Design a protein around this ligand. Structure first.
Ligand SMILES: CC1=C(/C=C/C(C)=C/C=C/C(C)=C/C=O)C(C)(C)CCC1
Ligand SMILES: CC1=C(/C=C/C(C)=C/C=C/C(C)=C/C=O)C(C)(C)CCC1
Ligand SMILES: CC1=C(/C=C/C(C)=C/C=C/C(C)=C/C=O)C(C)(C)CCC1
Ligand SMILES: CCCCCCCCO[C@@H]1O[C@H](CO)[C@@H](O)[C@H](O)[C@H]1O
Ligand SMILES: CCCCCCCCO[C@@H]1O[C@H](CO)[C@@H](O)[C@H](O)[C@H]1O
Ligand SMILES: CCCCCCCCO[C@@H]1O[C@H](CO)[C@@H](O)[C@H](O)[C@H]1O
Ligand SMILES: CCCCCCCCCCCCCCCC(=O)O
Ligand SMILES: CCCCCCCCCCCCCCCC(=O)O
Ligand SMILES: CCCCCCCCCCCCCCCC(=O)O
Ligand SMILES: [Cl-]
Ligand SMILES: [Cl-]
Ligand SMILES: [Cl-]
Ligand SMILES: [Cl-]
Ligand SMILES: [Cl-]
Ligand SMILES: [Cl-]
Lengths: 242, 242, 242
């Protein structure tokens, strides 16, 4: 929109640049990747920053940002707030690719991978619903709670059958490392929503709320992808033999 | 919306309660489920009532309900009618989870499961299109007819290759029982649409139309899930050995 | 809309008729298809014209067509143009079914098929974003470029691991033929977008732009499906034995 907020603007352009750099680094890193399992995981990995760039373009252009009036009870009840709904929306595409990458690395069951992606999509769409609901504060937090439930379904797989699959696939070392990053970093998103302007609004700055999500993306997406890709490039032997 | 219709309101809250009770019953029933195939189907099953609750929250909050003006020729031509479009929309997520549960139980081909889910999604989205179309009555019913065609694609699998897979997976008894429930109960949805306010409007009450869908959901989702889960919990032997 | 343009109208009705004829021809051609791989690919194939008909109904009814104001710099800057956004939207469902059909025929890896469909969906949604963006010309073309990148991900599979899979599946002859059709015909869509009213507008006619896409659909969907189905019906032996 007619945005003149440098704090807000910078939080978006910064990741267009970092995501672009990521794509180049990854394409390069895959220069000598053997066909099969390795090459595939490499493909799933390149998609992460590509989707991310698309997301930040939507926000920067104003296409996926809108004004939402907060309901009675909210700290900003009666006011219109800038909602970056494009973030929720695009996650529904980026979280599934992150999970496919991990699923392949761990060589998990097809039925398990499918159930997890379904739960992840549900988590993202109910989160969008929480942000878009304007009739009553009760419904906004009800969606947030249901979204949390789907999040638990996704996490349960990472702590159970996916870890067991990685152990039999010979990738337990890298999986355990990535699992910690996923759980810790993913817990950051619902905390930002809750503390930010759309939840409790303990922090009323939209620019600050935006920078919090942008920093998380840097680690949950770009650094995560790099660590995964770097391991695969140096362990094509154990990955391909699966 | 500014709804004061108790008939309409009650048809929604009733299922928020029943769906909530279902989730608890299911989590409990899965207390002693062995890892592998069983545990997975248990996961796919818990997702059904979770998605359902999300759907009823959307309707209750007014987020996924809207006013649609009926075209010339319609029994209510020129009037604005309350459309619970959130139902169509959410089915696109709930019907696929019901099918995954059945697909696993029957241990069907990956290519078959994928084709069926695609047809199911097409059925749900063209049904939404039928409800949202306002230019001419002809187009509303054209979408309804195409939606019926996708429904036939889904059903053809249940009467052919999915039954054959269940027979070789040792789950033909439970599959045949669930198949009857699915076909009979699913035929109920297009009949309600056709007889209700959005189709022919033989019944002009939006509250009554809503209660019809709510009753179907109780059986097609909650009772269906219970029957499936109860069998799996008592036959983990034949399910896991797949 | 209040369309009186015969050029535009005819480009839509023509394909409702051709798509309808296609469905009948295909159902018929599958009369004596043996169960298993063959029958499945037959199913994936019938879905193509079904989805296509749904798409043209959306456009004809006006449900998925809208007016978009072009930004400064555009050849039609400041004017409102008719956007057939329903095409982009529905492709997100039709391109994936075309790819499933090919994936089965070639008996490709599950992880590869999944990565490709994800990239295809990204291609379609960023293309929609390009069409819907109105704030600045820069963002419209930025989305177009990102969409092109996803297109490359999809194509890379057709020239690498999918061809290798078809060779080991004994379907390299038919795959190589279909691959040429897919690549050549798919390159046509971004060219029409670029040359048409939404891109550079070298051709400002919306009716002409619409006919270009309609002709491509005839070959990329109907003729493509026929060629694939006809081969399968005459080679059920090599297909099923997979
Ligand atoms: C549970 C929950 C959430 C979780 C979102 C997550 C975990 C997103 C992760 C995205 C990643 C890591 C990368 C891109 C919301 C929707 C904020 C709000 C409702 C509660
Ligand atoms: C064919 C058809 C329909 C079918 C819907 C079905 C079969 C929905 C089932 C949902 C279930 C069982 C649970 C949640 C519509 C969209 C009403 C209208 C157009 C004709
Ligand atoms: C890369 C690209 C495109 C590609 C679309 C394609 C390749 C569509 C194919 C559809 C088929 C074949 C059948 C139905 C857009 C969205 C036009 C515009 C942005 C650049
Ligand atoms: C699953 C977690 C659900 C938490 C529900 C929190 C409901 C409280 O909601 C909070 O109440 C405060 C005081 O009125 C307001 O200032 C905040 O803006 C509002 O979000
Ligand atoms: C696939 C089944 C298609 C059925 C198409 C039915 C078209 C008739 O449509 C019906 O006509 C009645 C009389 O004008 C009206 O009162 C109804 O509201 C209208 O839905
Ligand atoms: C990936 C390919 C990106 C191409 C970016 C093209 C940007 C130019 O954009 C073009 O500029 C012309 C002159 O101002 C206008 O007349 C056209 O309408 C406009 O689309
Ligand atoms: C690998 C399977 C993926 C299936 C994913 C289904 C859900 C896709 C949701 C896609 C939303 C895309 C919106 C992008 C918006 C933007 O960045 O401009
Ligand atoms: C297991 C694969 C699933 C892929 C599913 C693709 C289509 C998803 C459609 C999701 C619509 C979700 C809307 C929920 C709305 C609500 O309840 O508030
Ligand atoms: C086989 C997996 C498919 C998963 C597909 C996910 C994305 C589906 C997008 C569907 C858009 C449908 C809109 C149809 C509109 C119309 O024709 O009226
Ligand atoms: Cl993203
Ligand atoms: Cl913003
Ligand atoms: Cl539902
Ligand atoms: Cl309602
Ligand atoms: Cl289409
Ligand atoms: Cl048009």
């Amino acid at each position: 929109a007619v945005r003149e907020n440098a704090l807000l603007s910078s939080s978006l352009w910064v990741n267009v640049a970092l995501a672009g750099i990521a794509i180049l680094v990854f394409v390069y890193m895959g220069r000598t990747i053997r066909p099969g399992r390795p090459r595939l995981i490499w493909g799933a990995t390149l998609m992460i920053p590509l989707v991310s760039i698309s997301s930040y373009l939507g926000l920067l252009s104003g296409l996926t940002v809108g004004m939402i009036e907060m309901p009675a009870g909210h700290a900003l009840a009666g006011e219109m707030v800038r909602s970056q709904w494009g973030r929720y929306l695009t996650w529904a595409l980026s979280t599934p690719m992150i999970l496919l990458a991990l699923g392949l690395l761990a060589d998990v069951d097809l039925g398990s991978l499918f159930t997890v992606i379904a739960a992840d999509i549900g988590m993202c769409v109910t989160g969008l619903a929480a942000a878009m609901t304007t009739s009553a504060l009760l419904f906004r937090w009800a969606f947030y709670a249901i979204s949390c439930a789907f999040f638990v379904v996704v996490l349960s797989a990472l702590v159970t059958d996916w870890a067991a699959s990685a152990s039999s696939a010979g990738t337990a070392e890298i999986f355990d490392t990535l699992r910690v990053l996923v759980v810790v970093l993913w817990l950051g998103y619902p905390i930002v929503w809750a503390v930010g302007v759309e939840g409790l609004a303990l922090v009323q700055s939209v620019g600050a709320t935006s920078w919090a999500y942008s920093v998380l993306d840097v680690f949950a997406k770009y650094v995560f992808a790099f660590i995964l890709l770097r391991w695969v490039a140096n362990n094509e032997r154990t990955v391909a033999v699966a």
